[PDB]
From a paper:
To understand the molecular basis for antigen recognition, we crystallized the Fab of aducanumab (AduFab) and solved its structure at 2.1 Å resolution. The key interactions with the Aβ peptide are formed exclusively through the complementarity-determining regions (CDRs) of AduFab, with the major specificity-determining contacts contributed by CDRs 2 and 3 of the heavy chain (H2, H3) and CDR 3 of the light chain (L3), and a minor contribution by L1. Aβ binding causes only minor conformational changes in aducanumab, which are largely confined to CDR H3, indicating that antigen binding requires slight accommodation by this CDR. Aducanumab has a very shallow and compact epitope-binding cleft that makes fewer interactions with the Aβ peptide. The shallow and compact epitope for aducanumab is consistent with its low affinity for monomeric Aβ, which in turn, potentially provides aducanumab with distinct advantages over other high-affinity antibodies.
Author numbering:
A (entry chain L): 1 to 211
B (entry chain H): 1 to 139, 146 to 225
């Protein structure tokens, strides 16, 4: 099998910026490499085939180069419709393999998250489960760290989080983290805290409540 | 006009079977190789299988060998994927794509035309409507609704019957270890507004015919 390593996995840029994406093959695949663009909820769209051949109708600001193991996709000046995820694909031998993808996102100024914590409702507690929610709102960049502490015990493995896509009007992100406990474990403890780390904050921000 | 129309996806239990169809129009179907490519939720593209233009040579990724069968009916201009012995990891959007091929042997070259995809969900969970719990605001304030323990996707969430849109963030669903999905929808409002303004999240889970209007108040 031929592994295709794509880098970087993500990048932020502005309109008019030049963008370079790299795909590396585990062995020589000659020029049998293709580049695809994909937007959320949409099928992939072919941009370049045979390493350097533009698919008909693809704007000329897209270009591809390389042969053997090293390949590059270049957008000479980024346009608003170019913010998407890009995939490389070797077509040299089966099994056909794709790169892990490169997500091109919008560049903006740092914005710290507004943090809120939500205790479980009494309604849910009658069901036998307690969900505690921490909301990180309208921040940039996307990377943020959330730590759950119950009576100063770090919670690990009992939380899930999801992140929105960049807001259309301000390009911020929002993140929610849900800590799931049984009702018995929730009633056994008092202090519930969500500690947020972000580059917009000079030191971690903790929001908490006492049951 | 070149078209690849897909169908046949659905929600099934592990061990069960599905058959996907990809009906082509607007080109010489019998002169193209055809691929199946899948994309699990939030993941990348994974090649599944290919079939030659004349239906002779077929190739598969290792994880579907002996379970999936690619085939084509050139008289109907249709490509198929018989998916047997399904596993939870087979959950993905499945795309078909044409490949003109290269060489006298006609090995894969590039995929220039794609179907829009059909969704396959493999899970031992059964259909269940969600419970809607409030995310009450306390002491610019944030509130929302926790739409927990439903299957399958999707649910829709609006606020105040569509009349409240700005400040609203409806997060992507997460799959819990129970096999049930959960998502949260939040909205920020001015702190002053809370005393008089009314706030209701409108939750609709069509697969279970569950419709819930939940009002969110300060506790």
């Amino acid at each position: 099998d031929i592994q295709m390593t794509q880098s970087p996995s993500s990048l932020s840029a502005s309109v008019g910026d030049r963008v370079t994406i790299t795909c590396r093959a585990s062995q020589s695949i000659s020029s049998y490499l293709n580049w695809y663009q994909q937007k959320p909820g949409k099928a992939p769209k072919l941009l370049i085939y045979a390493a350097s051949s533009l698919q008909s109708g693809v704007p000329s600001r897209f270009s591809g180069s390389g042969s053997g193991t090293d390949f590059t996709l270049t957008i000479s000046s980024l346009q608003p419709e170019d913010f998407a995820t890009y995939y490389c694909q070797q077509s040299y031998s089966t099994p056909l393999t794709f790169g892990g993808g490169t997500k091109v996102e919008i560049k903006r100024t740092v914005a710290a998250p507004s943090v809120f914590i939500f205790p479980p409702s009494d309604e849910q507690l009658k069901s036998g489960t307690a969900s505690v929610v921490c909301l990180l709102n309208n921040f940039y960049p996307r990377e943020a760290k959330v730590q759950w502490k119950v009576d100063n015990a770090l919670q690990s493995g009992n939380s899930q989080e999801s992140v929105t896509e960049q807001d259309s009007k301000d390009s911020t992100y929002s993140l929610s983290s849900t800590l799931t406990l049984s009702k018995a474990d929730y009633e056994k403890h008092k202090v519930y805290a969500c500690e947020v780390t972000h580059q917009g904050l000079s030191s971690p921000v903790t929001k908490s409540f006492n049951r | 006009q070149v078209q690849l129309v897909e169908s046949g996806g659905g929600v099934v239990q592990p061990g069960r079977s599905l058959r996907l169809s990809c009906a082509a129009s607007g080109f010489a179907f019998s002169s193209y190789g055809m691929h199946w490519v899948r994309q699990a939720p939030g993941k990348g593209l994974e090649w599944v299988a290919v079939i030659w233009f004349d239906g002779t040579k077929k190739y598969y990724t290792d994880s579907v060998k002996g379970r999936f069968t690619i085939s084509r009916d050139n008289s109907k201009n249709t490509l198929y994927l018989q998916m047997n012995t399904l596993r939870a990891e087979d959950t993905a959007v499945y795309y078909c794509a044409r490949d003109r091929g290269i060489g006298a042997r006609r090995g894969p070259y590039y995929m220039d035309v794609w179907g829009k995809g059909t969704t396959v969900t493999v899970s031992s969970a059964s259909t269940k409507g969600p419970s809607v719990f409030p995310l009450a605001p306390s002491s610019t304030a944030a509130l929302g609704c926790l739409v927990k323990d439903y299957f399958p996707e999707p649910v829709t969430v609006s606020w105040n019957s569509g009349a409240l849109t700005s400040g609203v963030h409806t997060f992507p669903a997460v799959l819990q270890s129970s096999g049930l999905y959960s998502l949260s929808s939040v909205v920020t409002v001015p702190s002053s507004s809370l005393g008089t303004q009314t706030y209701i999240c409108n939750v609709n889970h069509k697969p279970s015919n569950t419709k819930v209007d939940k009002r969110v108040e300060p506790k």
